[PDB]
Symmetry: C3
Subunit: 248 residues, 3 copies
């Protein structure tokens, strides 16, 4: 048996909202420590990793580890049927085949029960090398989303430069060019251990900022020659992290 | 002759909003007791009936019965020109041809006058079978609209099964299946005099829920072998009722 | 060297929003008295004129007159990158080629710098139409926008009839007709020096009401024989005026 009860169900809604634009299907790895999901995006450019610890659920039981193949488009459509204050319960039998989602309204007079067919996917885990923290930028998540949206009107790629005084986002295109300079202060903190200057495709960052509702801050972790990490904390539960390799 | 003054003009706006998605044209029957309208949908699947009693109007005068053929799209375009707090007056001369709508703002500095051409429509007598109240469900109108929208993501048809303790709405499709169970308590009341289980096309129920702004509650009246009634009360005036035949089973 | 600092940058955002539906490219004429723009719209029916006087800017310096050819679509995209409370500075070197727009948040922790390529345009050469103030109506801008939208559901043109006590807006089409009567009082004032009854295309007036955010009042200046003026004041700075001919003449 697998059964997990989450009183703040909107978390799951926001999680699915943050993944379906990027991934069509993926494996949810369920174990006694909680829920882990790792997947390349459907264009095989970026990597996504989700962690939800068992301690963040109001009830959690996992008799046997399972790897559930899920069409995220379908699961997101089902989670649109939950109200933002619903209690959400996931349940799956040993040897999978279907996953049940139960939404209990807080009045207690209405209960919704959805059953989703599970898919047959063979995906193997990619390893994540140890992180080098050359620059770490923590900033309001809405400000980062607006930065990416603004510069994608100028160009298709952003140059992120992190040096002692601050962090700069630059783009260049047919209409001209732009840059946005942030200095350390809705607080902005900058840990610069060695300067970095890297180029990234704005299309993928604009996908990553769909996780903005999960947290009021985002963390950017940059180092030379390794993927940028864009990370959102899922309070008292885990994280959603996106990895993106720099250009050229 | 005909003249009716309605101080809460937004009612008419909401009425037209609730009809234009289902029917294009309809005959407004005007008499001294008030306004009646009945029409099948443009696909002749569902039926709509509207009553606005003369007593719900602040002024009401009708010297001779009229059957006004109205393009509901045009009437809706005109009523979009009224503000939500406008006083709305309808006026028509004996033997019709046009309907006048006057919108008076509450400031009193602005008055709008619209004249709408009427049209010639074929009217087919339709009878309503007396209602059998096998199951009656009263619930918040917003909750019913959300139930219908949620399950139309799962499938195109909803099975409504009504039993002693409660009512269940079920759907099935690709993606899988879902059901939503309501128990008696934003109050939900369930009168089950005999069990009913019927299937209905979610597309038409989704048309019916465009009436949600007229009332905070909706009533579902279900019986075996007779069309479902989905009813919204128009407080202190009348009602909008929608009728939908169940889907026919296979074999 | 041209440099202009505007502490209420949202003015510039609203201006570009009020022009971009109507004009793709136009010349911004910069002089020591300020910023002037005039252009026919992209369909060559209506005329648009913008004035922003130097005194309205908190800083203003113009060493030499410039004619900056600007793609207004590009400029509006850049100005969407400014927040509504940003301080905006425009800057251009002598002999143009690019225009710099600097957006400073008021906390001072964020600064955005955009460089926009200018273009060489062959301007049409236009006079500003003659004025006669036969009738002048001042009214809330939102009410005027609502009148134009509502009647464009009835017909393609509005007949504006002006009398001493009030003004009437009428339209007619295949579904029927409508009129909206305003009397002099969110006040509407009417200076009627000669009676007027004039017809104008609602499609173009509906373009003009995109300037509604710049002002809570709009002024209609009507005459037989010269173009209607629809005017929005840009408070303590200038105006945006739209012109439409009453007749084909």
């Amino acid at each position: 048996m697998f059964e997990a009860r989450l009183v703040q169900g909107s978390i799951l809604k926001k999680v699915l909202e943050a993944l379906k634009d990027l991934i069509n299907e993926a494996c949810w790895d369920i174990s006694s420590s909680g829920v882990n999901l790792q997947s390349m995006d459907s264009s095989h450019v970026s990597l996504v990793q989700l962690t939800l610890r068992s301690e963040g659920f109001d009830t959690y039981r996992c008799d046997r580890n399972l790897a559930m193949g899920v069409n995220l488009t379908s699961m997101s459509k089902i989670l649109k049927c939950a109200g933002n204050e619903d209690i959400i319960t996931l349940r799956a039998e040993d040897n999978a085949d279907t996953l049940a989602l139960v939404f209990e309204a807080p009045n207690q007079e209405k209960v919704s029960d959805y059953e989703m067919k599970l898919m047959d996917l063979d995906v193997e885990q990619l390893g994540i090398p140890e992180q080098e923290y050359s620059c770490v930028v923590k900033m309001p998540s809405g400000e980062f989303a607006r930065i990416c949206r603004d510069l994608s009107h100028i160009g298709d790629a952003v140059v992120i430069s992190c040096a002692k005084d601050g962090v700069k986002f630059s783009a260049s295109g047919e209409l001209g060019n732009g840059n946005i300079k942030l200095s350390q202060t809705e607080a902005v903190t900058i840990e610069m251990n060695e300067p970095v200057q890297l180029t990234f495709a704005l299309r993928y960052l604009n996908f990553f900022t769909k996780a903005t509702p999960l947290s009021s801050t985002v963390t950017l972790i940059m180092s030379a020659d390794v993927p940028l990490v864009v990370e959102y904390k899922i309070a008292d539960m885990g994280h959603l992290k996106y990895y993106l390799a720099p250009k050229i």
